[PDB]
């Protein structure tokens, strides 16, 4: 949140403060707020529109401050922790699917408009399954792909 203000003359209200020869600083591109309209806003001063100018020297510098070098890209984590992590996720997925069975097979005939009102408690199947699908697949295929890259790049 940022704002820039320019003081206007409080002696001249009958005339126009800015003629607005175009539609740049207006309801265009921004709207005046409510709390600014209480303590002042278009009274005693006004607001101006901010844009950010970015030079190429800093433009091609700002977009690259998150990456790492090549040791991060080609690194298998460990296989013992990976096996234990997959074991833990499959182990909780067992009980989660066991709950999912009862959740599907109950499905009390009364329109979700209230089945979303008895879901607002602690109930959780059908929603944690696909998250576990994502964290299993996107952590297994990446590790297998990196294992292949490591085993045939170096030789």
């Amino acid at each position: 949140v940022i704002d820039a203000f320019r003081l206007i003359n409080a002696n001249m209200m009958v005339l126009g403060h800015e003629p607005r020869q175009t539609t740049s600083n207006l309801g265009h591109l921004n709207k005046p707020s409510i709390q600014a309209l209480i303590h002042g806003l278009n009274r005693h001063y006004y607001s101006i529109t901010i844009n950010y100018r970015k030079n190429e020297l800093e433009q091609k510098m700002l977009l690259n401050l998150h990456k790492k070098s090549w040791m991060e890209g080609l690194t298998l984590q460990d296989y013992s922790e990976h096996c234990k992590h997959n074991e833990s996720v499959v182990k909780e997925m067992l009980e989660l699917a066991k709950n999912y069975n009862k959740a599907v097979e109950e499905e009390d005939k009364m329109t979700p408009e209230q089945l979303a009102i008895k879901n607002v408690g602690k109930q959780d199947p059908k929603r944690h399954l696909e998250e576990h699908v994502d964290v299993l697949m996107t952590s297994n295929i990446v590790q297998c792909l990196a294992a292949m890259l490591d085993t045939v790049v170096f030789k």
Partner: protein, 50 residues
């Protein structure tokens, strides 16, 4: 006729010569690049919008 047919020639009190067996060489890590293709395709099915 059977002494001149093929390997394992016979006639001098025992049938000898032209033994036949196998060595079985293997590497088995050759389709690893192929495996890469497979796993990338998996991500392909996971990532194009239905």
């Amino acid at each position: 006729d059977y002494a001149k047919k093929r390997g394992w020639v016979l006639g001098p009190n025992n049938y000898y010569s032209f033994a036949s067996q196998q060595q079985k060489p293997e590497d088995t890590t050759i389709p690893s690049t192929e495996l890469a293709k497979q796993v990338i395709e998996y991500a392909r099915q996971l990532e194009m919008i239905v």
